Amino acid sequence: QKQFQAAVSVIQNLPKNGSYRPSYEEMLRFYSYYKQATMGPCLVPRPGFWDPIGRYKWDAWNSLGKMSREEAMSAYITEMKLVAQKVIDT
């Protein structure tokens, strides 16, 4: 979608810190969908014990299996509405 690339833009230009503080879940959702969308199914090696953040990211992404690139695109957008909705209610 053009929408996906727009969503991605919004998120990329956000401030690193701010009034909303995203959950780890929220972060891993956006991260995994984004990888599924841009790189496809996770086929890289999984990071080791000394890289915990790498392991979480990988598990999230791998969890998506063989989800199509369109599938992940529209789920990214759905997650954006989800979080946007949380921010609106603050």
Ligand SMILES: CCCCCCCCCCCCCCCCCC(=O)SCCNC(=O)CCNC(=O)[C@H](O)C(C)(C)COP(=O)(O)OP(=O)(O)OC[C@H]1O[C@@H](n2cnc3c(N)ncnc32)[C@H](O)[C@@H]1OP(=O)(O)O
């Ligand atoms: C949610 C909607 C927004 C608001 C809705 C609007 C309506 C509401 C109205 C209210 C108005 C009030 C305004 C208040 C808003 C601010 C409040 C909050 O504090 S807001 C601010 C709170 N702070 C925020 O949440 C900040 C969120 N944004 C950021 O944190 C950064 O852009 C970043 C994390 C994506 C890093 O960028 P970068 O320079 O690349 O640094 P790294 O390379 O280290 O990134 C590492 C990995 O991430 C991967 N990846 C890349 N792009 C995306 C993507 N779009 N997605 C997912 N993943 C993406 C990338 O491929 C890489 O993979 P790998 O190679 O490691 O495997």
Ligand SMILES: CCCCCCCCCCCCCCCCCC(=O)O
């Ligand atoms: C409105 C908020 C937008 C958020 C965009 C997040 C972008 C994705 C990249 C960040 C990687 C997530 C790593 C989190 C590790 C979790 C640690 C743990 O669960 O204790």
